[PDB]
Design a protein around this ligand. Structure first.
Ligand SMILES: C[C@@H]1CC[C@@]2(OC1)O[C@H]1C[C@H]3[C@@H]4CC=C5C[C@@H](OCCC(CO[C@H]6O[C@H](CO)[C@@H](O[C@H]7O[C@H](CO)[C@@H](O)[C@H](O)[C@H]7O)[C@H](O)[C@H]6O)CO[C@H]6O[C@H](CO)[C@@H](O[C@H]7O[C@H](CO)[C@@H](O)[C@H](O)[C@H]7O)[C@H](O)[C@H]6O)CC[C@]5(C)[C@H]4CC[C@]3(C)[C@H]1[C@@H]2C
Ligand SMILES: CCCCCCCCCCCCCCCCCCCCC(=O)OC[C@H](COP(=O)(O)OCC[N+](C)(C)C)OC(=O)CCCCCCCCCCCCCCCCCCCC
Ligand SMILES: CCCCCCCCCCCCCCCCCCCCC(=O)OC[C@H](COP(=O)(O)OCC[N+](C)(C)C)OC(=O)CCCCCCCCCCCCCCCCCCCC
Ligand SMILES: CCCCCCCCCCCCCCCC(=O)OC[C@H](COP(=O)([O-])OCC[N+](C)(C)C)OC(=O)CCCCCCCCCCCCCCC
Ligand SMILES: CCCCCCCCCCCCCCCC(=O)OC[C@H](COP(=O)([O-])OCC[N+](C)(C)C)OC(=O)CCCCCCCCCCCCCCC
Ligand SMILES: CC(C)CCC[C@@H](C)[C@H]1CC[C@H]2[C@@H]3CC=C4C[C@@H](OC(=O)CCC(=O)O)CC[C@]4(C)[C@H]3CC[C@]12C
Ligand SMILES: CC(C)CCC[C@@H](C)[C@H]1CC[C@H]2[C@@H]3CC=C4C[C@@H](OC(=O)CCC(=O)O)CC[C@]4(C)[C@H]3CC[C@]12C
Ligand SMILES: CC(C)CCC[C@@H](C)[C@H]1CC[C@H]2[C@@H]3CC=C4C[C@@H](OC(=O)CCC(=O)O)CC[C@]4(C)[C@H]3CC[C@]12C
Ligand SMILES: CC(C)CCC[C@@H](C)[C@H]1CC[C@H]2[C@@H]3CC=C4C[C@@H](OC(=O)CCC(=O)O)CC[C@]4(C)[C@H]3CC[C@]12C
Ligand SMILES: CC(C)CCC[C@@H](C)[C@H]1CC[C@H]2[C@@H]3CC=C4C[C@@H](OC(=O)CCC(=O)O)CC[C@]4(C)[C@H]3CC[C@]12C
Ligand SMILES: CC(C)CCC[C@@H](C)[C@H]1CC[C@H]2[C@@H]3CC=C4C[C@@H](OC(=O)CCC(=O)O)CC[C@]4(C)[C@H]3CC[C@]12C
Ligand SMILES: COc1cc2c(cc1Oc1ccccc1)[C@H](Cc1ccc(Oc3ccccc3)cc1)N(C)CC2
Lengths: 648, 625
């Protein structure tokens, strides 16, 4: 059994090295079959399948019984959505839940039973799966007649369970929670004290006066004063809340000013600073944990390989075979194996082993495939001329000319009648510029080779853009037959292809926006954008979870409360025609929650839902303002600060 | 001879500069040292600060007099127009004070330093321009509409504050990146305008022509019309919302906070750098004083008797001065070395804690329990509980009397409860004074605040009981009493620790935010004066309005007819809410070319209010933690 244990130790070294490369903790059980199961489960295919299943189970909310498949979200104009049959979404959800159960079983087998019991995330996964399956069985025993599906609230949790960055962000929020709670208590005391002071201050005065008007409009009773001051805390009705009092007497504004100085200025920014105080070393801590995990992986692999000899160390042949069996990029794998081959038969110690496995911190520069060579001197000279970077200068100049022409002929044509436009010069210029784009793409492909041209991301991007523009232009020319003087390119019922062509042609500006890191001031902005996109998961997952949970709650609460009866106050929900901001389906719920995250016109929604669904509904919206506009927006600002100050 | 006096006076002034963290570039002569001590005295600095305050406050009583009860154009009475000579004589007195200050600054420091210092050259230029403008405005009989000299007033404040010169130096360093972010935001606006004009106009309300599209997108950038700008399109099709959403993601959320990040990247170690510079100045001052005292002797060292004479002359806190003097006495007649001299002046960093006077020391058997109970914080918690009960009673009587007019009925029970609670407050104050002594009780700022407020409450309650129950109405004096009780309820914040820590943090932030306050004052002053010069009499109440217009919302009080109304209008514009209402109003009244002023105000005001202020709060919060 010596050979069996030898190959088992080789497999242990391989899996430990793979964990070190992928920054995975070494806590899973190491067995003959468990190693194969671990390498199969953490493969790219299985992880992509799990992520797609999570995406599908989140996307099912768009196709549930409150279907989100209508052209418009306005209550007045929306038609009945396509209601899916009972078994369709239930079957899709049950297959997603079976996939999740398989994933949970694999996770619970790869790790120990003790680890599964001790881990709170796996216990929560099991509880959520059991509750979701029970709710699905209940909702299927009745024939899709359960109005509220609690399982839909637990769908975001899966997204939390399969993301380490999301869990780190949640932990940072948890750490920031006590100071935020203390500041919130102070702010509630502030709100209550100013509410009582306002109610007592605007109580007197003559009838129909400015002070009496202020009392009637905003500070009549305690809940209305509380709502008014809470909205003023978000500065959503800053002039309206004080216009009557400020017109009655000039000094009253002082009061409101003090409020905005204390509540909206000091305490909200204090909350922002508190939330940022926990994301202060986010990226640095993540890098430190990644390096620590890599070091642990390499150390454990060395320790495993050392026992195979029984001085301590790893034989070069065993390390070479392990590197041969390790899933790694070609450059790093080849460099590491050549460095191992450089060592003779002498055993490798732990320190030199770790220094060898420090080669994985090298950012390999991928060389673009060489351009094909042409024997003809004229052909190769033309290839050199067209492959020169000054050709990109000429292309950018022509692109700027195209963009300026499109903008000018859009501004000019806004004044003239919609049916008397000529669009001849603009059509000719667009045709010429699209032909030039096609010629430039063909020349670049000729000079750099098809694979070489497609190697660059900017080159493939502009190639796709010019292909789409060429298709649109050819279709337009085929429909409208070679523009002439007075060539109207818009016809009723012809999809308005001209507008689509000009809108896709306005994506040219990326040719100039992608070269902004050239100037020094824009370099830090570009670095911040890149870091925020790389760390997009940290805030994006929290955003998705919050929006999903609150959309489901709103649909369960405010499904059919806003109905237009077949005169309204000037500042009301009906007069502004906000009927499209309802909770009748998932997309409308998401748009309404977005419009509420932007605290503007918050009191309009508050009053509308107080009148339609009840006075207590405000609580929900208040919670929304606490969860999205206060916690998540400050989280995004903290991540922006961290990504800006990381490199700098 | 007199050289000994000169040396000891130079040592005294150097020690004072080290204590106050000032430079040593000032000339040190017999007369110059006396002038330096007089000029940097507390009296002269307070006088200069008050003169700056007065010259800034004169804008409230200028020709557009801000002396009307209301700011509504419909109801505003004719303001009291001051005579021609009054505010001109006050301003010329302030300018003469500033000229004296500038001459003293140019005399104490070298003429070469004055020539090389750009701030002093700017001070001289501003003073000369202000005097010329004042003479011109006085040659005419106060008939110059625009006073250019009024725009240069805030500079005086800016010239006197050293903290503002550093917050401006940091803003100057952050300007190259804020300019790039502004260029990116302008590109964002232009691209989304030229895209919406194709998407929607190809509508009549928000994206009809180029100026309307630009204004609509800029307002959405400030999120002042977020649902309104999208309702006409989001009603036609859901996907259109995506467009606006993308905008709000790119401009309002990302770039407007990238501005905050850019500003904070410069204030990252502002407090630490200031502290290091202050310590360096203190060390340099102590070193210069040591060198002077060593030169006085005639090895190198400070004679302890000379050092005691210097400390005697030095204006310093009694505790630190006595500690240093007794340390020098303990040194005896031994000559002090350079390192010992440097380490001697570390006593000022001891941060001496103020002690409280002892308890009255009454008899034990009869009053020991009383002393223990009243001195204990459980009595303070009982007082807080009773204050909360008073607050609950006020809330109950507000809620029950909300349906009817609060002034009508149901105030007898509230009156009795307030009388009982004020009696309890008086009893608690008397018991605390008994347990701590009058000077002991007044030592604590919370205790003196509580005592003052309960004295005011008792006076008002007794007056109301005597006059009515048997000038102001009964309801007005009940409003005053209830508002004073609500204000008194603030005592619960220092007591409760979770609120007390946050209150202390907020107070420390306020104490360190004076540079932000000065910058805000400068910006508000300049923009208010420009708005008065531009939009003075444009908004008039014609003797029907659209539902969401300037007239239907009755925003008439937000005008620029006077300085206070200008300040309130600039405040209401700083809070970007309902920005489009003012934009449309002044477009219709003052002409199309008025959005430039409001856009410049939005930039200069939103930066200060959101990004610079958040950067300062971040720095101040992280330094303490
Ligand atoms: C209306 C609109 C909406 C909003 C919007 O505008 C207005 O917002 C605007 C914000 C724009 C982004 C800003 C900046 C970048 C990064 C850039 O990435 C260069 C490639 C990376 C590597 O480059 C080297 O890679 C290879 C090695 O030689 C060569 O191959 C290549 O030639 C060479 O350059 C850049 O990173 C490295 O260089 C950085 C330099 O600073 C360092 O920092 C950083 O640390 C470092 O890794 C690619 C373009 C992109 C995403 C822009 C797209 C357009 C926007 C989204 C606009 C967007 C449209
Ligand atoms: C998001 C929705 C709320 C949390 C849902 C899961 C809770 C149960 C669970 O699974 O909790 C998971 C953990 C439990 O603790 P720990 O991290 O030590 O467990 C793992 C320990 N290990 C790493 C050693 C294995 O707690 C959390 O991470 C969440 C803590 C509470 C956050 C509340 C945030 C409320 C405002 C959110 C605004 C956005
Ligand atoms: C999208 C971007 C929009 C942002 C625009 C406004 C936002 C912030 C506004 C910011 C608040 C608006 C008020 C700012 C008013 C500035 C007037 C300064 C007059 C002083 C003078 O005459 O000379 C300027 C002085 C001369 O001393 P110097 O250092 O050369 O020698 C050494 C002397 N020292 C060591 C004592 C300092 O330079 C400075 O001390 C540097 C900073 C002061 C002005 C530079 C930029 C100020 C902020 C940006 C202005 C708008 C931008
Ligand atoms: C207008 C409001 C929109 C609100 C919209 C609400 C409706 C929701 C629509 C569906 C959203 C679907 C989210 C995508 C799901 C997904 O791809 O999840 C997988 C990733 C992987 O995350 P990871 O960082 O690779 O985790 C690794 C941890 N292991 C697996 C090793 C344990 O996990 C992630 O962290 C992916 C997060 C990506 C989120 C991007 C933002 C999307 C916004 C749209
Ligand atoms: C909205 C305002 C409209 C316009 C209103 C106009 C009339 C009201 C004007 C109020 C401000 C008047 C301030 C006059 C005194 C002054 O100059 O204060 C300076 C201090 C900061 O002084 P410092 O920089 O700490 O001093 C360092 C030592 N030196 C260099 C002096 C030797 O403080 C400052 O820098 C200014 C702090 C101001 C108070 C906080 C903001 C209040 C608002
Ligand atoms: C942030 C929000 C706005 C994102 C929403 C994304 C999707 C949920 C939306 C975007 C556009 C919508 C589509 C717009 C138009 C139509 C055509 C519509 O066709 C009809 O016959 C509608 C009813 C009718 O008019 O008769 C069916 C729904 C559908 C596909 C909609 C389905 C839901 C979509 C994909
Ligand atoms: C924390 C809370 C509970 C107390 C502190 C809140 C402050 C914002 C208060 C404390 C004193 C208040 C002031 C007390 C008295 C007056 C005079 C008052 O004058 C009139 O109403 C006279 C004209 C008329 O009644 O028609 C206008 C409000 C004002 C300035 C108040 C404005 C609001 C102030 C500054
Ligand atoms: C900074 C944070 C911590 C502030 C949190 C404030 C909330 C605790 C306040 C603000 C608005 C308040 C609400 C304002 C109005 C009402 C209606 C009120 O009911 C009525 O108006 C009575 C008539 C009826 O219910 O029909 C019940 C309390 C409630 C929900 C309030 C509950 C407490 C709320 C959510
Ligand atoms: C941020 C802003 C709101 C601060 C404004 C502060 C001052 C410029 C204001 C606050 C209260 C005002 C006072 C309120 C009431 C009066 C009584 C008023 O008496 C009248 O007879 C007015 C005309 C009339 O009603 O007949 C004269 C102006 C005066 C002192 C006003 C002068 C200007 C004051 C001091
Ligand atoms: C991120 C920052 C740097 C963006 C700055 C953008 C400004 C330079 C733009 C945005 C809004 C623009 C304004 C939008 C609308 C108008 C009205 C427009 O009016 C007309 O000339 C047509 C109507 C008429 O003449 O009656 C004149 C230009 C102006 C002031 C524009 C001037 C340029 C402004 C201030
Ligand atoms: C530099 C900038 C200009 C690039 C990014 C701008 C985006 C906000 C644009 C680019 C493509 C646009 C989309 C192009 C086409 C459509 C289909 C369009 O469909 C209809 O209007 C059909 C139904 C109807 O008209 O009733 C709705 C807007 C939408 C999703 C657009 C939404 C806004 C988008 C995402
Ligand atoms: C291959 O092509 C180029 C290469 C390089 C540049 C530019 C190029 O292309 C153009 C040249 C001229 C006009 C248009 C495109 C820049 C110069 C540059 C700097 C800032 C700019 O900022 C904007 C201007 C307008 C709109 C948006 C941003 C734009 C260009 N160099 C400094 C580096 C290499």
């Amino acid at each position: 059994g010596a050979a069996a244990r030898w190959d088992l130790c080789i497999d242990q070294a391989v899996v430990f090295i793979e964990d070190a490369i992928q920054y995975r903790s070494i806590n899973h059980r190491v067995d003959a079959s468990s190693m194969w199961l671990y390498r199969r489960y953490y493969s790219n295919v299985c992880q992509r399948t799990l992520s797609f299943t999570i995406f599908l189970i989140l996307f099912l909310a768009f196709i549930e019984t409150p279907s989100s498949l209508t052209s418009t979200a306005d209550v007045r104009y929306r038609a009945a959505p396509w209601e899916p049959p009972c078994g369709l979404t239930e079957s899709v959800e049950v297959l997603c839940l079976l996939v999740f159960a398989a994933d949970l079983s694999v996770k619970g087998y790869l790790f120990g039973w003790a680890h599964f019991q001790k881990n709170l995330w796996l216990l929560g996964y099991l509880v959520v799966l059991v509750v979701s399956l029970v709710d699905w069985t209940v909702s299927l025993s009745l024939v899709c007649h359960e109005p509220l599906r609690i399982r839909r609230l637990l769908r975001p949790f899966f997204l939390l369970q399969n993301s380490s960055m999301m869990k780190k962000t949640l932990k940072c929020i948890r750490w920031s929670l006590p100071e935020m709670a203390s500041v919130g208590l102070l702010l509630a005391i502030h709100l209550c004290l100013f509410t009582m002071f306002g109610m007592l201050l605007f109580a007197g005065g003559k009838q129909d006066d400015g002070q009496d008007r202020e009392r009637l409009t905003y500070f009549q009773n305690l809940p209305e004063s509380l709502t008014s001051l809470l909205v003023l805390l978000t500065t959503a009705n800053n002039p309206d809340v004080m216009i009557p009092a400020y017109s009655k007497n000039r000094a009253y504004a002082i009061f409101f000013i003090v409020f905005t100085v204390i509540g909206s200025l000091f305490l909200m920014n204090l909350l922002t600073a508190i939330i940022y105080s926990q994301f202060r070393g986010y990226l640095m801590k993540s890098l430190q944990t990644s390096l620590f995990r890599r070091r642990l992986g390499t150390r454990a692999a060395f320790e495993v390989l050392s026992s195979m000899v029984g001085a301590v160390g790893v034989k070069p042949q065993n390390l070479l075979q392990v590197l041969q069996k390790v899933q790694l990029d070609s450059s790093h794998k080849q460099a590491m194996m050549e460095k191992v081959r450089s060592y003779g038969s002498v055993l490798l110690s732990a320190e030199e082993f770790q220094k060898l496995f420090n080669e994985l911190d090298r950012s390999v520069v991928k060389e673009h495939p060489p351009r094909p060579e042409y024997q003809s001197p004229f052909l190769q000279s033309a290839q050199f001329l067209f492959g020169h970077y000054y050709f990109d200068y000429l292309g950018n100049l022509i692109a700027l000319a195209n963009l300026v022409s499109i903008c000018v002929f859009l501004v000019l044509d806004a004044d003239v009648l919609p049916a008397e436009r000529d669009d001849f010069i603009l059509g000719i210029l667009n045709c010429v510029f699209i032909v030039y784009y096609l010629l430039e793409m063909l020349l670049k492909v000729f000079a750099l080779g098809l694979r070489g041209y497609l190697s660059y991301p900017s080159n493939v991007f502009d190639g796709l853009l010019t292909v789409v523009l060429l298709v649109l232009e050819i279709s337009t020319l085929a429909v409208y037959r070679l523009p002439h003087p007075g060539w109207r390119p818009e016809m009723v019922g012809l999809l308005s292809l001209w507008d689509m062509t000009r809108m896709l042609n306005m994506l040219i500006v990326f040719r100039f926006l992608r070269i902004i890191p050239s100037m020094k001031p824009m370099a830090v902005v570009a670095s911040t954008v890149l870091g925020l996109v790389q760390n997009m998961r940290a805030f994006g997952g929290i955003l998705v979870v919050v929006y999903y949970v609150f959309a489901i709650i709103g649909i369960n609460l405010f499904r059919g409360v806003i109905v237009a009866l077949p005169s309204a106050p000037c500042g009301s929900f009906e007069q502004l025609e906000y009927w499209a901001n309802n909770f009748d389906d998932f997309a409308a719920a998401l748009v309404t929650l977005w419009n509420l995250m932007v605290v503007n016109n918050w009191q309009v929604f508050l009053d509308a839902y107080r009148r339609y669904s009840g006075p207590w509904s405000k609580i929900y919206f208040v919670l929304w303002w606490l969860v999205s506009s206060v916690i998540w927006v400050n989280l995004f600002l903290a991540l922006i600060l961290e990504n800006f100050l990381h490199k700098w």
